[PDB]
């Protein structure tokens, strides 16, 4: 079945999809058409954003439903991360990042295995599935990195 994706410059992308496809499958089809990496897209239907492990069916998306494509271009926000070795690094972040996403960014810069990471802010351990906005952590805060093995 076809579906259409409208872009902020008025383009209309036509996709071949199946009702059981995931949003990540659709983003892959959009990457093939447009050259936008899937991690850079935000798909929208009926005023709702579409989450990666859900299907077109899950959002009632049927034949010739029109979605909308926004690029992930939100900024500004940097936070600091101080390790216990006195190294401080800067991190590019968004309030919607999970603490998990934050650990994957710390791996991007310092190669530290995310399984080894623990992030302390305000006397507590920061939980993997909450966001920076859940904690009201804003720009130029300093998170504190701590390592544990197993």
């Amino acid at each position: 079945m076809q579906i259409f994706v409208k872009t902020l410059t008025g383009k209309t992308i036509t996709l071949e999809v199946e009702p059981s496809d995931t949003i990540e499958n659709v983003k892959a089809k959009i990457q093939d058409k447009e050259g936008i990496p899937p991690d850079q897209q935000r798909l929208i239907f009926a005023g709702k954003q579409l989450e990666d492990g859900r299907t077109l069916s899950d959002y009632n998306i049927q034949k010739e439903s029109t979605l909308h494509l926004v690029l992930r271009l939100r900024g500004x926000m940097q936070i600091f991360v101080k390790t216990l070795t006195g190294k401080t690094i800067t991190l590019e972040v968004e309030p919607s990042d999970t603490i998990e996403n934050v650990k994957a960014k710390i791996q991007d810069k310092e190669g530290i295995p995310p399984d080894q990471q623990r992030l302390i802010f305000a006397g507590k351990q920061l939980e993997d599935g909450r966001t920076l906005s859940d904690y009201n952590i804003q720009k130029e805060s300093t998170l504190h990195l701590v390592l544990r093995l197993r």
Binding site: X76, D108, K109, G111
Partner: protein, 239 residues
């Protein structure tokens, strides 16, 4: 925390990722083949607007493009008018318009005000000029989004759950409110200046064949080029 940093070589970018992701190390290698330098901008809510401010004013400083200045002043008048037609009282935006217009003319050489690279740097590094110019750009953005509420509504309703008017007042106009794709399309159309955004993340769909992708905003290579890493803009300088 300086609102806008000195020119650094790309080696400082590459040092941030030296001990980390190979994808990013390679993307930065590849970015070096086209860009000499970067200017880090402070990572507060206005980093895109601050990057744009300084990149454009530095462009007019370096180019002495009087014709670009005339053209953009026309676009700024039309913006003044659309904010008027939308119920904004002049005392709410026209001070921001005056500060920016004056910056623009100060960067043109020849006469009295005329400033050089260093005074422009300290001006955009000084809260009480930089902030006013950020606000000017936010109001031009708000004007352009509300002028086109019908085109932007489906994207904004999914971004926020707001109305276009809501969006404008809560997400675009206030200082510090982070910007996104809608903001950029709006400002670039409204002022008619093109932007190249180099996207630096860990994506790599084609293993072993790595490129840095980019998104163009074009109402002729964009003379505004920004580095973007998910969450944050700095300024790029091409070779």
């Amino acid at each position: 925390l300086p609102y806008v940093g000195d020119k650094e070589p790309l080696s400082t970018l590459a040092a941030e990722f030296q001990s980390g992701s190979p994808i990013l190390q390679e993307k930065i290698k590849l970015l070096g083949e086209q860009y000499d330098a970067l200017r880090r901008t402070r990572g507060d809510g206005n980093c895109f607007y601050r990057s744009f401010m300084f990149s454009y004013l530095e462009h007019i400083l370096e180019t002495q493009d009087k014709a670009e200045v005339e053209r953009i002043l026309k676009k700024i008048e039309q913006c003044k008018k659309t904010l008027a037609d939308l119920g904004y009282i002049e005392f709410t935006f026209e001070d921001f318009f005056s500060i920016f217009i004056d910056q623009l003319e100060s960067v043109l050489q020849g006469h009295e005000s005329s400033i050089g690279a260093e005074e422009l740097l300290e001006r955009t590094r000084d809260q009480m000029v930089s902030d006013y110019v950020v606000m000017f750009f936010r109001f031009v953005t708000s004007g352009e989004i509300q002028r086109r509420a019908e085109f932007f509504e489906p994207f904004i309703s999914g971004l926020t759950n707001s109305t276009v008017v809501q969006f404008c007042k809560a997400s675009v106009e206030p200082m510090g409110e982070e910007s996104d794709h809608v903001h950029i399309i709006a400002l670039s159309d409204a002022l008619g200046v093109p932007i190249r955004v180099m996207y630096l993340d860990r994506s790599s769909c084609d293993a072993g064949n790595i490129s840095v992708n980019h998104h163009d905003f074009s109402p002729e290579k964009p003379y505004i080029t920004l580095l973007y890493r998910p969450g944050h803009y700095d300024i790029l300088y091409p070779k």
